[PDB]
Design an enzyme around this catalytic site. Sequence first.
Site, PDB file in Angstrom:
ATOM      1  N   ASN A 162      58.784 -19.568 -99.651  1.00 47.17           N
ATOM      2  CA  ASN A 162      58.029 -20.792 -99.635  1.00 47.17           C
ATOM      3  C   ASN A 162      57.133 -20.852 -98.389  1.00 47.17           C
ATOM      4  OD1 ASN A 162      58.248 -23.976-100.095  1.00 47.17           O
ATOM      5  ND2 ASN A 162      59.406 -22.724-101.696  1.00 47.17           N
ATOM      6  N   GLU A 163      56.005 -21.497 -98.525  1.00 41.63           N
ATOM      7  CA  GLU A 163      55.086 -21.693 -97.429  1.00 41.63           C
ATOM      8  C   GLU A 163      54.897 -20.468 -96.519  1.00 41.63           C
ATOM      9  OE1 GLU A 163      54.854 -25.599 -95.465  1.00 41.63           O
ATOM     10  OE2 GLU A 163      56.642 -26.270 -96.969  1.00 41.63           O
ATOM     11  N   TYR A 191      49.510 -32.409 -99.617  1.00 42.31           N
ATOM     12  CA  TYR A 191      49.906 -33.739 -99.151  1.00 42.31           C
ATOM     13  C   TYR A 191      48.739 -34.676 -98.905  1.00 42.31           C
ATOM     14  CZ  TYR A 191      54.505 -31.617 -98.415  1.00 42.31           C
ATOM     15  OH  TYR A 191      55.770 -31.045 -98.573  1.00 42.31           O
ATOM     16  N   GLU A 199      64.917 -30.924 -99.484  1.00 41.05           N
ATOM     17  CA  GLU A 199      65.167 -29.958 -98.435  1.00 41.05           C
ATOM     18  C   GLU A 199      66.360 -30.430 -97.580  1.00 41.05           C
ATOM     19  OE1 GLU A 199      61.584 -29.454 -96.137  1.00 41.05           O
ATOM     20  OE2 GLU A 199      62.411 -27.737 -95.001  1.00 41.05           O
ATOM     21  N   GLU A 236      54.755 -29.049-103.902  1.00 40.16           N
ATOM     22  CA  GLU A 236      54.779 -30.048-102.865  1.00 40.16           C
ATOM     23  C   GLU A 236      53.542 -30.932-102.953  1.00 40.16           C
ATOM     24  OE1 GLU A 236      55.448 -28.581 -98.847  1.00 40.16           O
ATOM     25  OE2 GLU A 236      56.758 -27.073 -99.616  1.00 40.16           O
TER      26      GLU A 236
HETATM   27  O1  LIG Z   1      60.243 -28.784 -92.156  1.00 44.91           O
HETATM   28  C1  LIG Z   1      59.162 -29.719 -92.298  1.00 44.91           C
HETATM   29  C2  LIG Z   1      58.117 -28.957 -93.105  1.00 44.91           C
HETATM   30  O2  LIG Z   1      56.700 -29.277 -92.939  1.00 44.91           O
HETATM   31  C3  LIG Z   1      55.998 -29.107 -94.231  1.00 44.91           C
HETATM   32  O3  LIG Z   1      54.924 -28.111 -94.269  1.00 44.91           O
HETATM   33  C4  LIG Z   1      57.082 -28.727 -95.254  1.00 44.91           C
HETATM   34  O4  LIG Z   1      56.920 -29.271 -96.586  1.00 44.91           O
HETATM   35  C5  LIG Z   1      58.426 -29.076 -94.607  1.00 44.91           C
HETATM   36  O5  LIG Z   1      59.486 -28.178 -95.024  1.00 44.91           O
END
Ligand SMILES: OC[C@@H]1O[C@@H](O)[C@H](O)[C@H]1O
Lengths: 491, 139, 491
Positions: free
Chosen positions: A170-171, A237, A26, A293
């Site tokens: 994403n997310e 994570y 990133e 991730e």
């Molecule tokens: O920007 C920090 C973010 O926190 C996490 O959820 C992500 O992987 C990352 O992009």
Amino acid sequence: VASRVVVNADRVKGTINRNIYGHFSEHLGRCIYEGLWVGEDSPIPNTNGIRNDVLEALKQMKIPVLHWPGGCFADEYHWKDGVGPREKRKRMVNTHVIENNHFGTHEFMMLCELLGCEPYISGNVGSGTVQEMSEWVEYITFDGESPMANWRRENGREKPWRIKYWGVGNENWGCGGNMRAEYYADLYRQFQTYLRNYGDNKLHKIACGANTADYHWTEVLMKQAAPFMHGLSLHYYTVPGPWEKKGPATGFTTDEWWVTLKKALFMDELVTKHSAIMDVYDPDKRIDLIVDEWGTWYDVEPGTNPGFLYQQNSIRDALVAGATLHIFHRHCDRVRMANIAQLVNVMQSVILTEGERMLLTPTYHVFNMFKVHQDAELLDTWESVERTGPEGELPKVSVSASRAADGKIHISLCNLDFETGASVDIELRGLNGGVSATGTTLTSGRIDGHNTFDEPERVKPAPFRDFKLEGGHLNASLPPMSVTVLELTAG
Amino acid sequence: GGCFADEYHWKDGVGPREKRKRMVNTHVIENNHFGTHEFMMLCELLGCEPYISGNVGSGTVQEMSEWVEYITFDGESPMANWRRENGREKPWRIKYWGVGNENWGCGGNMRAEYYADLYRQFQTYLRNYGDNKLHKIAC
Amino acid sequence: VASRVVVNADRVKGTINRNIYGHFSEHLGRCIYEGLWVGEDSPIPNTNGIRNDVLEALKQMKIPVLHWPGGCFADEYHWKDGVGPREKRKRMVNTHVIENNHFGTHEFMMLCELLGCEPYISGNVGSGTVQEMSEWVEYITFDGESPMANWRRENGREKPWRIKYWGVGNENWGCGGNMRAEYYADLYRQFQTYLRNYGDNKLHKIACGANTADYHWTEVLMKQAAPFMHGLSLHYYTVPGPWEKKGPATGFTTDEWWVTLKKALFMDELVTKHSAIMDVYDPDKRIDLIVDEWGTWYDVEPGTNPGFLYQQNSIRDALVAGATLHIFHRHCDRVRMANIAQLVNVMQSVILTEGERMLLTPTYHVFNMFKVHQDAELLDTWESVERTGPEGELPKVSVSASRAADGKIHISLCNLDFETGASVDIELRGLNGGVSATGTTLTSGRIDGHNTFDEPERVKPAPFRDFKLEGGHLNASLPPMSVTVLELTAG
Ligand SMILES: OC[C@@H]1O[C@@H](O)[C@H](O)[C@H]1O
Ligand SMILES: OC[C@@H]1O[C@@H](O)[C@H](O)[C@H]1O
Ligand SMILES: OC[C@@H]1O[C@@H](O)[C@H](O)[C@H]1O
């Protein structure tokens, strides 16, 4: 009390897709700037602006796929800000961090071609528009005439690029728009419609999947959007402590060792349960699960900016990586890509840099040792392993076996106990000839053993000879806190 | 359109005909020489009503609203001034206005419930200027 | 072109619950009256009114469980009608079929005791009341004083009976009340609440599951009622033609052979997909899947009443049974009971009767040959089999292996092709000693080969010797249209 394993060397259970060994970078902290991109006139030796020391190490590791630009950054990025003359790229400077957009689409695609890896790009759903994302794809891939394709040619790339992996946001449950799964699924369906296959390019469209144990997300995306995706992502994570005090990368307690590994192994249950939901809607397993991730997340190194996510990397990280990769192998019927967070200087990195100096983390060495599993055939193995940890809550050993394209067999083994070695008895069945074996092992004398810029080789692979092979049994004595790979050759 | 309507960006089809957007696929040429002015002229020559479908699937609410304003508004604004610069001084009339087409398929693969919400949102901004009266058509 | 199989004789994959070999008898046609119950002074030799010839044949087959009284009858039955002085029980007669209720609760419970099998009763949800079902259980199982237990003692059974398997309604989506799954789930939860464990009895409560590919039913019952059940049922009949012209039991075409077997094998997909939904809500596989109606369903024999469901039974039926039982074995991690429809004179029966005469069907002989798999350990097997049928749509061979409690190994094999034999090569791994083998086979010279009352032994098991065993390989030549069992002994 040996762990026991039987390898059926003639029984193939699946293919370990090479993209299981993927990576993620990133625009955050020093992952892109300094970690990879130094600029063409940097005194750090570089190839077209990318530092050579990192390039060479990543090539040796055989990086298969790289995900960019995010992470949370992807749903904030407007790709047009990253193309065209460098001096007109968008510039942001916060004095509380510089994003000058010198690394954009062309520089990323150059990076991937230098590495020999697949590009995996995530478009912007949360703050982007349908036309914007459609235009990105067209810019990259269209071989005709149009304002986007002509722009790409102007900016120096005449023929289109090929790209398979395309993330449609994403997310999106969090930093990508705080979306309900039902709402995301509708945006997904709409956005993906306009991402075309130009020329001979074939897109592999990836919908944003769940965070951790959000099984409802998977159910909704599968039920509402399966016919419109090629893959679905998953994020998890390994965080030892609570969010607000995750714990340190080094100097941690024995309790933190055990908790870290137990949390890492939770991947297996997550992958199992998300896959079980995918099976209900896609019993033929057409759709990939993409664990894009994963990895450890600690408190940053003392005195560093928390926003830059810089952490050290120890033999504990090596064990997380090796045990997690093994879990992906056991699920290689559905998991077809994974991407550890993040490549350089951020979270569970393979490389850390400090100006012109660099080091290879213990995480790097696992990826480089396990590269023999890339695109290999997973072999049927069964096991009965010793327990370890408090109350025997952990398996002492994690083992995986595969067959490479030249017929060699690789057996990788993790010993999760930092206190004693692990005896393992491996029986090999279904061989024709005899075999011989060599080995390598990665271990440490300290539970937090790690590399530094002054001492970059404290933890690194070494020859492994503490085994015997006779009468179809390979008995091995694995070191404490180790990752080992045995290579078997027939004849 | 048809499927083209939810891919079209109407601004690509107005302005000096020579300088409009061009696309060519080898593997079909769209030079955008037939755009809004040419269509509206076509309907006047034929004596037929025009029926335009705006772009929901890949278009924005402002973009569609501006299309209507460009066509129909008789005052001063950036869109109406642009139409006059492009050679049509007085506005045109139009009744039939499609708010997206084939939105269940090539216009965004939408569920009906989601399209209905976009429909309600887009249509809100399609105004009746002057003595024009829109007849809004949902997909 | 041999089929190949490997048996890992030392690797156990699960336990084949004996109840997989279960049976089902409804008050329909001549399944209960004449088929089992003849009355104490019938000239058919009997024990307490149950015919001895059937009793002896079922005991030899080792019947593990018997489901009664239905089927559709269960949600029409009022159990109190079947208890009390046999002479004064409820009578119904339709001219347009006689139910005198002489076979009721006491007679059924006696039947199961004589057979040595578990009783499996389905209570009435569709037209019954919560109190009525609760009272049934209490009548059967309570050892204290109450109106129901006192009544049981007056009716001649002093001590209570034990019963585990208790169905809370049957076919509730159809003849048991035309219920939506969501409504049945609510009635289920309500009814089950009042079914008590008296004394040392422990009920195993079974909710009515799906018909065929009604996956929505399984999802609803699991999501809304899983914590309140021990088991969930599933129904699937193999019907060669359309409903209105199913096709005959004998004299059928070769196309009907293939279609029958292909439809039978659809069980695997059904069980797989229903089990996948169960795994989402019950990942530890607590809840049994109970396939309590399965088997072939043909047009009745010409000139017989369609409402009595009497059909013949051929080697084609034997193959359906053997291949289906193998499917259940491969799902023995979740499928823990199955019940072929129905026991005597109805659908795919093991026995047909004509007054005092009886015959054993080819289906009987499969059950009796496969009884060695009851409660056995399923062994890990892998296979690569020839294809058969039009367009190679069918596997030529179906194979399963298990280990009995005395350490013998049984390997059963079905050859689905009626035209030629099937060669099979079996490799045995993980043995210590040498082994020897004997075999039995069930086959016919005609595709519709069957038993009749005048010739009750045209299709029956015979010694099987056409194999060789050497150097850990057993090569066998299976006859056309056959079911075979090999018994292996170590030393
Ligand atoms: O920007 C920090 C973010 O926190 C996490 O959820 C992500 O992987 C990352 O992009
Ligand atoms: O454009 C090709 C499409 O096919 C049909 O669905 C539509 O009318 C047409 O626009
Ligand atoms: O009773 C006739 C019914 O048909 C089938 O649905 C049931 O098994 C049976 O009880």
